[PDB]
Amino acid sequence: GFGGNDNFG
Amino acid sequence: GFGGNDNFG
Amino acid sequence: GFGGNDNFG
Amino acid sequence: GFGGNDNFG
Amino acid sequence: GFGGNDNFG
Amino acid sequence: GFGGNDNFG
Amino acid sequence: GFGGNDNFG
Amino acid sequence: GFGGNDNFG
Amino acid sequence: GFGGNDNFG
Amino acid sequence: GFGGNDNFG
Amino acid sequence: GFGGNDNFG
Amino acid sequence: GFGGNDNFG
Amino acid sequence: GFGGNDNFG
Amino acid sequence: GFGGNDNFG
Amino acid sequence: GFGGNDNFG
Amino acid sequence: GFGGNDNFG
Amino acid sequence: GFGGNDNFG
Amino acid sequence: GFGGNDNFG
Amino acid sequence: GFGGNDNFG
Amino acid sequence: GFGGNDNFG
Amino acid sequence: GFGGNDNFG
Amino acid sequence: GFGGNDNFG
Amino acid sequence: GFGGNDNFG
Amino acid sequence: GFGGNDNFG
Amino acid sequence: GFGGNDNFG
Amino acid sequence: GFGGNDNFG
Amino acid sequence: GFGGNDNFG
Amino acid sequence: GFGGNDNFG
Amino acid sequence: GFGGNDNFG
Amino acid sequence: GFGGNDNFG
Amino acid sequence: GFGGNDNFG
Amino acid sequence: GFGGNDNFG
């Protein structure tokens, strides 16, 4: 359900 | 032809 | 989550 | 008896 | 000469 | 590129 | 609801 | 095209 | 009792 | 559509 | 996604 | 001790 | 309803 | 001397 | 050198 | 996706 | 460096 | 589908 | 010279 | 621990 | 209905 | 490319 | 009658 | 749908 | 010694 | 590094 | 009675 | 298309 | 395109 | 006489 | 007709 | 990436 370019680090 | 990281349900 | 009769060009 | 393209969430 | 998803009653 | 429930003629 | 004597073609 | 009970002749 | 050029439908 | 002695050609 | 006591007659 | 038809999201 | 060569892409 | 593309009725 | 629906009467 | 009666020289 | 009890859809 | 530290009692 | 998640239409 | 679409020259 | 020495290119 | 009635002496 | 690299996609 | 002389890098 | 995609008549 | 349609004289 | 290198297209 | 005595060098 | 003494960790 | 980890293009 | 020590990348 | 006549003494 998100964009796709994520960085939960 | 669209962005690339999408959510369609 | 969406209607159902959709047109993704 | 209803529309035809429907998502019941 | 119609065309489309339809709901008669 | 066009809608999806069309009547041509 | 509906009856008859119609044309859906 | 037409539809319904009719009476020709 | 009519007569002549005609189209139906 | 139409129907008669439509000489054609 | 719903309370639940629903009726689609 | 709650209703019974619940939508725990 | 219509007539011709047609590039319905 | 007609031509093109015609929808004759 | 021309289009291909021509009607040289 | 083009007209149909063309003269690409 | 995040909590630990998560829902990543 | 939630946080994760829940106590339905 | 570019990322990797591309879409050449 | 970084984005994902990078150009380290 | 035309001359007779034509060059339909 | 020409008419048709030519005379190259 | 054309230069050559040409792309009729 | 593109030119033909490209340097995808 | 010239362009490479040329049209000489 | 460059396009593709070149003529280094 | 003419040059010798002429174009009659 | 052209004269006849041409000297593309 | 970079120095040489790197430590992507 | 120079560093040792270099990137001469 | 150029220098000689060039970079056509 | 560079000219070509260098003297990295």
Side-chain angles (χ1 to χ4, degrees):
Chain A
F2 304 104
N5 281 337
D6 301 337
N7 196 37
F8 324 89
Chain B
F2 296 93
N5 288 333
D6 288 343
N7 190 29
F8 293 122
Chain C
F2 59 88
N5 183 77
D6 290 337
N7 190 30
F8 301 102
Chain D
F2 301 98
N5 289 337
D6 61 356
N7 192 31
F8 285 98
Chain E
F2 61 88
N5 58 342
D6 275 346
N7 190 35
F8 303 77
Chain F
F2 290 95
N5 286 331
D6 287 343
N7 188 38
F8 293 101
Chain G
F2 292 93
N5 62 42
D6 278 340
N7 189 30
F8 282 122
Chain H
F2 64 93
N5 59 347
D6 270 345
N7 289 285
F8 306 72
Chain I
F2 49 82
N5 285 339
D6 61 356
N7 192 31
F8 291 93
Chain J
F2 59 88
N5 64 34
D6 289 345
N7 192 31
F8 287 120
Chain K
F2 296 97
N5 283 333
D6 290 341
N7 191 30
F8 308 91
Chain L
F2 291 86
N5 289 333
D6 293 342
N7 189 34
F8 285 140
Chain M
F2 64 92
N5 61 339
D6 286 338
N7 195 34
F8 298 124
Chain N
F2 49 89
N5 285 333
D6 296 344
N7 192 338
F8 271 109
Chain O
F2 279 101
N5 274 314
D6 294 340
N7 192 32
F8 307 84
Chain P
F2 293 95
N5 297 333
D6 282 330
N7 186 35
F8 286 5
Chain Q
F2 293 93
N5 291 337
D6 289 341
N7 190 40
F8 292 95
Chain R
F2 305 95
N5 187 0
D6 289 344
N7 284 256
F8 306 74
Chain S
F2 283 100
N5 177 67
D6 287 339
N7 189 31
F8 297 85
Chain T
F2 297 86
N5 291 334
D6 290 344
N7 188 34
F8 303 111
Chain U
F2 299 97
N5 288 337
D6 288 341
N7 187 35
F8 293 127
Chain V
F2 290 104
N5 283 337
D6 291 346
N7 292 116
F8 300 111
Chain W
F2 289 103
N5 185 31
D6 293 340
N7 193 31
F8 309 129
Chain X
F2 298 90
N5 286 331
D6 288 338
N7 188 32
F8 286 119
Chain Y
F2 297 93
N5 289 337
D6 299 348
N7 191 39
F8 307 79
Chain Z
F2 284 102
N5 182 323
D6 289 338
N7 192 35
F8 303 108
Chain a
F2 292 94
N5 283 336
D6 287 340
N7 189 34
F8 307 125
Chain b
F2 283 94
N5 183 46
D6 286 338
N7 192 28
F8 304 104
Chain c
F2 285 103
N5 185 296
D6 291 337
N7 196 29
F8 305 88
Chain d
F2 297 97
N5 283 338
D6 286 341
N7 188 34
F8 298 81
Chain e
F2 294 90
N5 289 334
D6 290 344
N7 187 33
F8 304 89
Chain f
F2 296 98
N5 187 329
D6 296 342
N7 185 26
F8 304 99

